[PDB]
């Protein structure tokens, strides 16, 4: 009995930093954003940190830049669409661009 999975490509981008980060990342369909970040780190040149919360992990640092007071790393889908899901819940689609943006409130 055969079994199959699709390999998709997700573009990960961070424009809140100089220099900006932008890379195409290959993962299996069904991977979460957190799986994309893990693969980006394995490829080299991407780092991040997460912390636990009652609703799952969330980003506290991206490419060495920690969110400060009244700031957080926001997850968006290109062009400018906030995703109201955590990194461990959102499952990107083939060809999607995922952006991490440091925002203050």
Residue numbers in the entry: 305 to 409
Lines quoted from the article behind this entry:
To address the question of how Cbl mediated TC assembly proceeds, we determined crystal structures of apo TC-beta and TC-beta in complex with Cbl, putatively representing the first steps of TC assembly. We expressed the two domains of TC individually in insect cells, which lowered the affinity for Cbls while retaining the structural integrity of the domains, as no denaturing was required to generate the Cbl-free domains. After proteolytic cleavage of the MBP and further affinity purification we obtained pure, substrate free TC-beta. We next determined the crystal structure of apo TC-beta at 1.57 Å resolution, which represents to our knowledge the first structure of TC resembling a putative partial apo state of TC in the apo form (i.e. TC-alpha and TC-beta are not associated with each other). The structure was highly similar to the Cbl bound state of TC-beta (rmsd = 0.41 Å for 97 Cα-atoms), with minor changes evident in several side chains compared to CNCbl-bound TC-beta. The structures of apo TC-beta and CNCbl-bound TC-beta provide insight into distinct states of holo-TC assembly. They demonstrate the structural integrity of apo TC-beta and Cbl-bound TC-beta and therefore further consolidate the hypothesized mechanism of Cbl dependent holo-TC assembly. Virtually no structural changes occur in TC-beta upon Cbl binding, arguing against an induced fit mechanism with regards to this domain of TC. Lastly, we demonstrated that the production of apo TC-beta is a robust method to probe the interaction of TC with alternative substrates, as it is easy to produce and to co-crystallize with various substrates.
